[PDB]
């Protein structure tokens, strides 16, 4: 539904070449940092489940957790941004192509408009 049938959509492609025009997610993005935090929590939970020292054991394993989560999060953020940008692109194009459906409205200042006053008594 919605974007699934967008014309020109190559099947089973995570990131289309069109996305490269969009700015890449910054490596200091808060969302990516939160993904890394999720990876760290995953490592801590793994240590707890296996009854290892929670915060000191398996530093390589925790590093792998954080790196994998950040690595997938970067592409997930890129795809999310691409999809929202596609939505905005299509919305603006549709507004331009259908002027009647989205008519400009006369702007009336508050002096002209009459809004009834309901006294708080």
């Amino acid at each position: 539904t919605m974007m699934s049938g967008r014309p020109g959509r190559v099947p089973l492609q995570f990131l289309p070449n069109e996305a490269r025009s969009l700015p890449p997610p910054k490596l200091t993005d808060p969302r990516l940092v939160y993904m890394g935090f999720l990876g760290y929590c995953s490592g801590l939970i793994d240590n707890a489940i296996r009854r290892r020292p929670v915060v000191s054991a398996g530093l390589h394993r925790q590093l792998l957790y954080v790196t994998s989560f950040v690595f997938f999060g970067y592409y997930l953020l890129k795809r999310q941004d691409y999809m929202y940008a596609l939505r905005d692109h299509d919305m603006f194009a549709y507004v331009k192509s259908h002027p009647e459906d989205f008519p400009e409205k006369d702007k009336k200042t508050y002096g002209e408009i009459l809004e009834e006053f309901h006294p708080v008594r």
């Binding site: 702007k107 009336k108 200042t109 508050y110 009459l114 006294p119 708080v120």
Partner: protein, 168 residues
């Protein structure tokens, strides 16, 4: 240092002392004792502190806000102009509250100062406060807790339409 025009005080008429009895007046001697024991030391202390203040004198300034377009000239959903105009309206609301406060202070000071003749000799201040209170009530009363420039504008429009209907 308060302005006399903003805070009027009637000129002071103090009767001159006219003793008719030989007995010494206790109040006079007690007041002289007070002057010597208290007033002179207090005056000297304030002299010292004022000298110290004069040694390093620095100034503070009263901010001036330029008038900005009102809500009446702000288009619908124009949040920038609406924000500017609403902030101006709130500042004016505070200023009108302060004006009402000044008039009420005049009223109370007149009640105290006149004494037993307050009913007649305070009539002018009471009339001033009556006018100010009517104006303030008409402008801002009943707007509610969430008072806004738009609601005050709506109340003014309602009043003006009622006045036109009175014109018939």
């Amino acid at each position: 240092s308060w302005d006399k025009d903003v805070y009027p005080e009637p000129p002071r008429r103090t009767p001159a002392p006219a003793p008719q009895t030989s007995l010494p007046n206790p109040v006079t001697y007690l007041t002289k004792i007070f002057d010597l024991l208290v007033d002179r030391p207090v005056t000297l202390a304030r002299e010292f502190i004022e000298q110290q203040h004069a040694k390093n004198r620095y100034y503070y300034y009263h901010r001036e806000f330029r008038r900005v377009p009102d809500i009446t000239e702000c288009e619908e959903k124009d949040i920038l102009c609406m924000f500017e105009a609403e902030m101006q309206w709130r500042r004016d609301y505070k200023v009108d509250q302060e004006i009402v406060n000044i008039i009420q202070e005049r009223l109370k000071a007149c009640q105290q100062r006149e004494g037993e003749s307050y009913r007649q000799n305070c009539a002018k201040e009471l009339e001033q406060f009556t006018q100010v209170s009517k104006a303030f009530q008409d402008r801002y009363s009943d707007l509610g807790a969430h008072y806004s420039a738009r609601k005050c504008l709506a109340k003014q429009k309602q009043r003006m339409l009622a006045e036109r209907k009175a014109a018939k």
